[PDB]
Structures are given as C-alpha cells and as structure tokens.
Design a protein around this ligand. Structure first.
Ligand SMILES: [Ag+]
Ligand SMILES: [Ag+]
Ligand SMILES: [Ag+]
Length: 649
C-alpha cells in the first residue's frame, strides 16, 4: 500500500537488481530501455537526442552488456549504433526488469563482461475463465504523450495476451532556452498465446511489431524508421523426474530494419560533407535458441544447457546525381549483405547450499564464435578480406561465495570471474582502419578477455536497508576506438585496469518519513598507452526524501554529479569520443502520487525544478548543421512537467 515514484532501485540480492518497470520513475524515461536503467546505480547513458540512448554500465559500453527480451537477443543495424539494442525495448510493456552485475552468470549468452540485463514477461496464471487489463497514460512538457495497454484473457488451459504502446515527444528545451533536436515517436504491438495442458507444462508462441522515428542532435543524420519484428517459441516443463526440476526450450527471431536520412527530418547542412539529400537503409536478422535443464537434489542445483545464435546484416543507400538533381531512394537498389555472425555454446552452473547460511556458486561456459565478411567492396575500393572467415573458442566462467552473518541480517559475498568476448559487428566492420600493419579491423581485432573480482554486502534490516558492490579487474585486448581528423576511426586492442563500486541505503525514519541515497563510481586506466580510458562516467550521488500517508505520497530528489577530469581525448567507442573534462552539476526534482481507487493510481512530477542548464560527460557532440560549436555536447532537458495515470483491472 501507499504508492510512490521510483527514484532509485536497490540491489536486493548479491549482484542482482530486480524492479518492476510498470512503476513510474522520477526523471521520466523516454519509453526506451536505456532510460529505465538510469534509476539503477552504476548505469549512465550516452544521449543522442530525445530518446534511444546507448547505456553504459560501470564504464563499459556496447556488447559488453547482454540485453535480453524474453531470454532472446535483438540487435540493431546502424553502423553507428543509432538504433542500439535498447532502442527497441519499451520497458512499460514488460513485467520484470532484472540486472546481474559483473561476469557472474553463464546462462544467458556469451561475452557478458559488464553485466547481463533481462527484460521478461511472465505467463498468465489463469484458474477460472477470466480477464485482466492494465494500462497507463502519460502527458508531459513538449508534446510528451504515451499510451500503454496490456491485456489478457484465458483459463486453466490457455491464454491470449496483447501488449502494446504508443509514445511521442516534441523537441525538448535545455536550461538555456534552446530547443534541442530531439523529436521522437515510438509504437509497439506484440501478442502472446499460451497453452498450459497441465500445471507441469506451458507452450507459448509470441509475435510482435514496432516502429519509430527519432531526431538526433548528435549524429548528423536522423532516424526516420526503426522497424522491429519478432517471433518466439518457448517450452517449459516442471518436475519431469525427482532430480529433474524443469526443462526450458526457447527459439527466437528478431528482425530490425532502419532508415536514416538527412532530409525527412532536418534539412541537409549545405556546408557539411552531406549537402545533398542522402539516405541509407540497413537491417539485422537475428535467429537463436536456448535449451537448459535445472537439476535439484540434496544440497545442490545444477543448470546445464546449450545455446546458439546466428545473425545477418545488410545495407543499401540512395544516390544523388547533382546535375539532374535526381534522387534515387535507397529502396531501388538491392540489399548488399556485409556480415554474418554465428555462435554456439554450452554452459553449467552449480550451487551448493552448504549449511543454511553459506552459498558457493560456480559456472562455466564454452563458446565457439565465428564471423564472415560479406563486403565485396568498400567506400568504391576493394575489400581485401571479402568472403573471408574467422572463428575462435572462448571459455568463460566464475565462482562466487556468499556468507550469511550469524546475528545481524547481513550477507557478504566475493566472486571471481573470467569472461571472453568475440568482437561484435561494430568493432569489426564500422571502423575505417584496423590496428597498425593490419589490412582492416576485421582481420586482426582480438577477442577481449576480462578477469574481475566482485564483492559487497547486503544489510536487510528493519528500518535501515543498505547494500554495496565493488569490483576490480583487468582487461586484455580491450577494443578501443581512436579518432583522427572528414573524421576517421581506428580500432585497436589495448590492456586496461578497471575499478569501481556502487552502494546505497534506504532508512525508514518514522512511520511516514523515508530517505534513501546512492553512490556510483567507475574508474579505468589504459595500461598500454599509460593514460585513462575514455568515456568513463564521473562519480554521482542521489539523495531521496519521501513522505507517505495512507493513499498518497510526496517526494524530493537530488542528483549531484562530480566532474570527470580523467579523459582520453579523441579516444572512445564506435559512438563517441572524449574531448574535454566535464563540469559537475546538481539537479533537483519533486514527485507525488495518489491512489484514487483500487484500480486507478495517479502520479506527477517536476524534473529539474531549477531549470538547470547542463550536459553529461558521455553525451554525444552536437552537429554543426544545427547550432553547435566545435565539440559542444548535446545538453540535458531543462524543467519538464509530467503527469501519469495507471489502471489495473
Ligand atoms: Ag545511422
Ligand atoms: Ag553524400
Ligand atoms: Ag548522411
């Protein structure tokens, strides 16, 4: 009882955060997966415009994070990651978002250096014949309007479930009265049919579509289409044997189909190097499965399984004859395939419940990765590695020990983990140069190998609930983009050390008054060049205060961010580079929520009450074609008002 808005999420069990994405969140998320991570300490976000941020976890970017949707993986097709994996995820339409920090699981795919992230839906539990609806409407500054409907009907034997949404916002303004190019629009409709013959069985087919557009204050091109499309089939059988607790089988298909241009939103910058109307279409076809058995007997729990994943990428672009001024749009030429990846793996995880206060946990997986370059030419010139292939075999695993204190309600844990990761599409194809003496990046960029120590504690008290997690680790053959002036990238392997932590606490002062706080630090050194790693988000703290009283509640929130002076100029990732140290800043916010009926909640909020003008260290450099000076990064929104209503029947 007693509703409120989510300003931070605490680490509830060791290494693991779990939150329900359907709750409101204090700086309102732009209906995008990265934004539902801001409220989890350790996550920072590279802003591209109004939405579609690239999420960074403990300084770690890109495929270093496994983002899953119903156990399945979905990748975008932009060579500059305009349509990052989270670009396609509306959390509101899911039922559970869960994060495991570190390389401390092997059940959910390969090369999870930084952490894995699992957006899930749960299958309906229908006894009688019956229905449930639940839905939300939101309304904010700058045209921000969102609709979300999730409904289902069924009985003991089966169910049908529709979930969908539509969301949009106009260009927002920063704290200096500047309209930031940041229009965006999204929608999504997925259905799920489920068959449950007995309670020990469940089969479930699911399909869905989504589209979206989004203007990008970074970039220099905009996203006029981000088509997504998904199939899925999952099998779950409980209590086969007395030791065979459950079997899981799961297949997934995920197609992405993006269109970027410089004329469907914005006008071609006449002084740029794209003064001509231009577009480029791109798509990514991902197919994959997973099969896993959970054995429980005596004091142990073994979870063996295998998984596989294939994915394919193609592109095609417009042409402009500038003496007819004729424009042949990119849908007239044929798709050129340029890359196919494969991966198969096997994994197990064993947990020993020694005594009732000690847990030992171990896991390994073996992954066989491979990739073939299909580019017959380059940007035209010859591609010296056309139709070439490569592969590798990448063992990864971990151990974690967790002890429960005798008296206080405290858990301690320490864990050691190794994770190897094959280069992703962007590390291999998107850079214009490889390492020195290499022909291109594809030929020589080495798989990245991470070894890291995690530890921390949980205090699950009465009035005081605290947690902390730290990490120290090294990174062999870290993959690192280096920028030279058009402007050109080079990908290299370097060695790195990393160190950091997160901690937080929430104290229930009196029966009405609650306060909480959080701290997030990351740190990275490039050992190869003796210098700092780029794109590391500075130290930040969050303070919350909350009054609750029966049916209603009111909140305040302080975000305070230190400056980042550890930077590597003209180095970074496929998306962005460092150039200047960042300023610190404070942002303050208010919120309230009210339970009208058993079925209708209300909430509202002011974000950035004092209309602070600020930008974040990780945000992209703004485009010269809009009013952006050299290297000036895209600013965060100024003051924004939002109200939101939540139904459930
Ligand atoms: Ag693009
Ligand atoms: Ag051009
Ligand atoms: Ag362009």
């Amino acid at each position: 009882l007693a509703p409120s808005v989510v300003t931070g999420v605490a680490q509830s069990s060791p290494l693991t955060i779990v939150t329900n994405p359907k709750e409101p969140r204090q700086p309102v998320p732009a209906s995008d997966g990265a934004d539902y991570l801001k409220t989890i300490p350790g996550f920072a976000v590279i802003r591209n415009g109004g939405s579609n941020g690239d999420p960074v976890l403990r300084g770690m970017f890109g495929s270093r994070l496994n983002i899953l949707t119903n156990g399945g993986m979905m990748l975008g097709a932009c060579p500059n990651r305009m349509d990052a994996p989270t670009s396609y995820i509306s959390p509101e339409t899911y039922d559970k978002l869960t994060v495991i920090k570190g390389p401390q699981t092997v059940l959910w795919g390969p090369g999870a250096s930084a952490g894995t992230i699992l957006f899930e839906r749960e299958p309906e539990r229908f006894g009688e014949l019956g229905s449930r609806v639940n839905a939300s409407l939101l309304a904010g500054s700058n045209g921000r309007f969102d609709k979300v409907l999730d409904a289902a009907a069924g009985n003991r034997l089966g169910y049908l479930r529709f979930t969908g949404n539509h969301a949009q916002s106009d260009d927002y303004e920063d704290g200096a009265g500047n309209t930031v190019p940041s229009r965006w629009k999204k929608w999504n409709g997925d259905v799920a049919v489920g068959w449950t013959p007995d309670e020990d069985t469940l089969i479930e087919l699911t399909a869905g579509k989504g589209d979206g557009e989004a203007r990008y204050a970074g970039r220099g091109m905009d996203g006029s289409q981000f088509k997504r499309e998904s199939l899925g089939l999952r099998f779950v059988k409980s209590n086969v044997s007395d030791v065979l607790e459950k079997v899981e089988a799961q297949v997934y298909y995920n197609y992405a189909d993006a269109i970027m241009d410089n004329f469907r939103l914005r006008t071609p910058d006449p002084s740029s190097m794209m003064p001509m109307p231009m577009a480029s279409q791109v798509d990514r076809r991902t197919l994959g499965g997973r099969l896993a058995a959970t054995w429980r007997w005596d004091d142990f729990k073994l979870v063996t399984g295998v998984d596989a994943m294939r994915n394919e990428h193609r592109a095609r672009g417009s042409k402009y004859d500038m003496m007819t001024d004729y424009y042949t749009d990119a849908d007239q030429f044929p798709w050129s395939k340029d890359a196919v990846f494969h991966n198969y793996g096997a994994f197990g995880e064993l947990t020993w419940f020694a005594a009732e206060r000690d847990r030992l946990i171990g896991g390994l997986r073996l992954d066989r990765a491979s990739v073939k370059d299909y580019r017959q030419t380059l940007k035209a010139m010859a591609n010296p590695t056309a139709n070439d292939t490569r592969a590798d075999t990448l063992p990864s695993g971990f151990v974690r020990y967790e002890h429960d204190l005798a008296d206080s309600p405290t858990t301690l844990y320490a864990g050691l983990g190794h994770a190897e990761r094959f280069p992703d599409y962007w590390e291999l194809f998107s850079p214009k140069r490889g390492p020195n003496g290499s022909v291109n990046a594809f030929d020589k960029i080495k798989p990245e190998k991470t070894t890291q120590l995690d530890f921390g504690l949980q205090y699950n008290g009465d009035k005081l609930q605290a947690w902390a997690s730290g990490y120290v680790g090294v990174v062999q053959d870290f993959i690192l983009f280096s920028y030279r002036e058009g402007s050109s990238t080079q990908a290299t392997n370097v060695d790195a050390r990393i160190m950091g932590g997160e901690l937080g606490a929430s104290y229930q002062l009196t029966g009405n008054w609650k306060t909480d706080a959080s701290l997030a630090y990351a740190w990275g050194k490039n050992s190869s060049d003796d210098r700092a790693l780029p794109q590391i988000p500075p130290l930040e703290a969050r303070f919350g205060l909350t009054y609750e009283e029966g049916d209603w509640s009111a909140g305040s929130l302080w975000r305070v961010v230190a400056p980042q002076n550890r930077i590597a100029r003209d180095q970074g990732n496929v998306v962005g580079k460092d150039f200047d140290k960042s300023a610190g800043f404070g942002v303050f916010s208010l919120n309230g929520a009210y339970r009208v009926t058993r079925n209708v909640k209300l909430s509202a909020g002011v974000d950035n009450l004092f209309d602070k003008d600020y930008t974040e260290h990780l945000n992209k450099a703004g485009d010269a074609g809009f009013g952006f000076s050299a290297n000036e990064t895209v600013p965060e929104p100024g003051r924004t008002f939002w109200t939101k209503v939540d139904f459930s029947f």
